[PDB]
Design an enzyme around this catalytic site. Structure first.
Site, PDB file in Angstrom:
ATOM      1  N   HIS A 291      60.052  45.646  37.314  1.00 17.76           N
ATOM      2  CA  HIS A 291      60.792  46.914  37.497  1.00 17.76           C
ATOM      3  C   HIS A 291      61.235  47.140  38.955  1.00 17.76           C
ATOM      4  CE1 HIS A 291      56.947  49.049  38.586  1.00 17.76           C
ATOM      5  NE2 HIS A 291      57.789  49.781  39.297  1.00 17.76           N
TER       6      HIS A 291
ATOM      7  N   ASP B 151      55.625  43.212  32.948  1.00 18.80           N
ATOM      8  CA  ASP B 151      56.201  43.754  34.183  1.00 18.80           C
ATOM      9  C   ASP B 151      55.815  42.879  35.378  1.00 18.80           C
ATOM     10  OD1 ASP B 151      57.524  45.349  36.001  1.00 18.80           O
ATOM     11  OD2 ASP B 151      56.092  47.021  35.912  1.00 18.80           O
TER      12      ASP B 151
ATOM     13  N   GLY C  76      56.432  53.984  44.828  1.00 17.38           N
ATOM     14  CA  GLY C  76      56.516  53.289  46.112  1.00 17.38           C
ATOM     15  C   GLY C  76      55.454  52.209  46.282  1.00 17.38           C
TER      16      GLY C  76
ATOM     17  N   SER D 181      54.678  50.438  43.628  1.00 14.46           N
ATOM     18  CA  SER D 181      55.173  49.530  42.588  1.00 14.46           C
ATOM     19  C   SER D 181      55.264  48.105  43.069  1.00 14.46           C
ATOM     20  CB  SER D 181      56.581  49.951  42.176  1.00 14.46           C
ATOM     21  OG  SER D 181      56.541  51.123  41.405  1.00 14.46           O
ATOM     22  N   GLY D 182      54.772  47.186  42.245  1.00 13.02           N
ATOM     23  CA  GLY D 182      54.887  45.764  42.534  1.00 13.02           C
ATOM     24  C   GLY D 182      53.789  45.222  43.430  1.00 13.02           C
TER      25      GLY D 182
END
Ligand SMILES: N=C(N)c1ccc(/C=N/O[C@H]2CCCCO2)cc1
Ligand SMILES: [Ca+2]
Length: 223
Positions: free
Chosen positions: A40, A84, A175, A177-178
């Site tokens: 994402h 994801d 923020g 994320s990942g």
């Protein structure tokens, strides 16, 4: 990261910032030329920023390297966030040292109760919005699959796990994320999703990295 602490400059040496004119996602360095992040987080024109603490100040240990290619998982579903995960290849190999270092992939999955370190430059507020400049850290346990599924009925797949605190107050957020969830020196999770941040009975949901090790290795081997 809500309810965490200031990591300390370069204490999380595998933590990367993905930059497209501004920080927009975290990632984890897994070897000199590859980063693991969330699908994402996909966009074009990614610059990978390694060795960062304050993302708004050049402090002396940074390496900025443009991505040459991104590979979103073949089965990523953006509606459900199943699978994801995404790999990013660097245009040139990072110079590895004590402050910029790869993180090991798991050889087996982690269990509920395992304590992990979650990190990133995301929102620090559960109600408002405040973005930190320096890297924030949270120590958090992996939760049981049953409690995870109970928290998010109909939404948790075999490629996801929950980590955090059902009481709320401590979580990853927008923020982050990942970015990494690291447990006993292994990358077990990727910051994926949640309902708000640090909300009661709504723990963080993370991509279950151990399911993807075969795909990661073979993808790296041929790209
Ligand atoms: N509670 C959490 N652990 C949590 C909550 C939310 C996120 C990330 N969201 O990404 C949003 C913001 C922009 C990209 C796609 O949509 C991560 C963790
Ligand atoms: Ca910096």
């Amino acid at each position: 990261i809500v309810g965490g602490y200031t990591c300390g400059a370069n204490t999380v040496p595998y933590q990367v910032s993905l930059n497209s004119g501004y920080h927009f996602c975290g990632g984890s360095l897994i070897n000199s030329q590859w980063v693991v992040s969330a699908a994402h987080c996909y966009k074009s024109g990614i610059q990978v920023r390694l060795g960062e603490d304050n993302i708004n100040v050049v402090e002396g240990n940074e390496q900025f390297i443009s991505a040459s290619k991104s590979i979103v998982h073949p089965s990523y579903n953006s509606n459900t966030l199943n699978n994801d995960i995404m790999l990013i290849k660097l245009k040139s190999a990072a110079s590895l040292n004590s402050r910029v270092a790869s993180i090991s992939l798991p050889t087996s999955c982690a269990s509920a109760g395992t304590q992990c370190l979650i990190s990133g430059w995301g929102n620090t507020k559960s109600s408002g919005t405040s973005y930190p400049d320096v890297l924030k850290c949270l120590k958090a346990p992996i939760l049981s699959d049953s409690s995870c599924k109970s928290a998010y009925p109909g939404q948790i797949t075999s490629n996801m796990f929950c980590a955090g605190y059902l009481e709320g107050g401590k979580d990853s957020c927008q923020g982050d994320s990942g970015g990494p969830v690291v447990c006993s020196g292994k990358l077990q999770g990727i910051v994926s999703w949640g309902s708000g941040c640090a909300q009661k009975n709504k723990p963080g949901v993370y991509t279950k990295v151990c399911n993807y090790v075969s795909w990661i290795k073979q993808t790296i081997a041929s790209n």
